[PDB]
Amino acid sequence: VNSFSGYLKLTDNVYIKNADIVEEAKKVKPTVVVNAANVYLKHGGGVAGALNKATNNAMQVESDDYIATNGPLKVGGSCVLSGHNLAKHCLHVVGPNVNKGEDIQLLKSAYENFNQHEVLLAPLLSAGIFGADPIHSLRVCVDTVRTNVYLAVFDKNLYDKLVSSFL
């Protein structure tokens, strides 16, 4: 039993809710919150900008030190950093950004990072400003992640569409 509430069950291991991931994280304080990161960990907008703002920019300060030491992530890759006031840990995962021309096949590789964590609160990778079809992203999630994933979908209209079209 865990503290996630109000989720709809899609499969054995995937759950979905219409929620603001920042507010969901603030209340649950999950072990892992997933950030929709880019390779530079520049948290300007979308989910990343919102998570970073909720940390009062501490996420960005930590991220800048990470990049200065290690260089950029790979598209499809990830790193574990602090969850600050939102979670124990933040798993920064880089899905492909269609608005930059990155290969959508890398979306499966991005979701594979979730399998290193038993339970996660996460957004749909490559959705929103990353330009992928969120319905495709949900399908890849269900077909790739084997650990327990709680998906927060900010837009109520999108949420209804994802549920109603789910196979």
Ligand X SMILES: CC(C)[C@@H](CNC(=O)C1(C)CCC1)Nc1ncnc2[nH]cnc12
Residues of the shown chain interacting with ligand X in the complex, contacts defined by CB under 6 A: 20-22, 46-47, 50, 53, 123, 128, 152-154
Nearer to ligand X, 22 or 87 (CB): 22
SS3 44: coil
Give min distance, CB of 129 to ligand X, in A.
8
Q: Minimum Å distance from CB 49 to ligand X?
A: 7
State which residue, 20 or 62, has the beta carbon closest to ligand X: 20
**Closest C-alpha to 117, from 146, 82, 153:** 146
Token pair, residue 160, equals: 């209804």
Question: What is the token pair recorded at 100?
Answer: 């930059």
Q: DSSP for 95-152?
A: ---GGGT--TTHHHHHHHGGGGSSEEEEPPTT-GGG---HHHHHHHHHHH--SEEEEE
Residue 68 or 84: which CB sits closer to ligand X? Answer: 84
Between 4 and 154, CB nearer to ligand X = 154
Shortest Cβ distance from residue 14 to ligand X (Å)?
Answer: 16
Plot region of 158 (φ>0 → left; ψ -120 to 50 → alpha; else → beta) = alpha
Q: At what angle do helices 58-70 and 46-54 cross, to 10 degrees?
A: 120
Nearer to ligand X, 56 or 116 (CB): 56
- As measured in angstroms, the least distance from the Cβ of 137 to ligand X is 11
- Return the closest-CA partner of residue 144 out of 82, 81, 93: 93
Residue nearest to ligand X (CB): 154
Least distance CB 71 / ligand X (angstroms): 27
Alpha-carbon gap, residue 159 to 83, rounded angstroms: 25
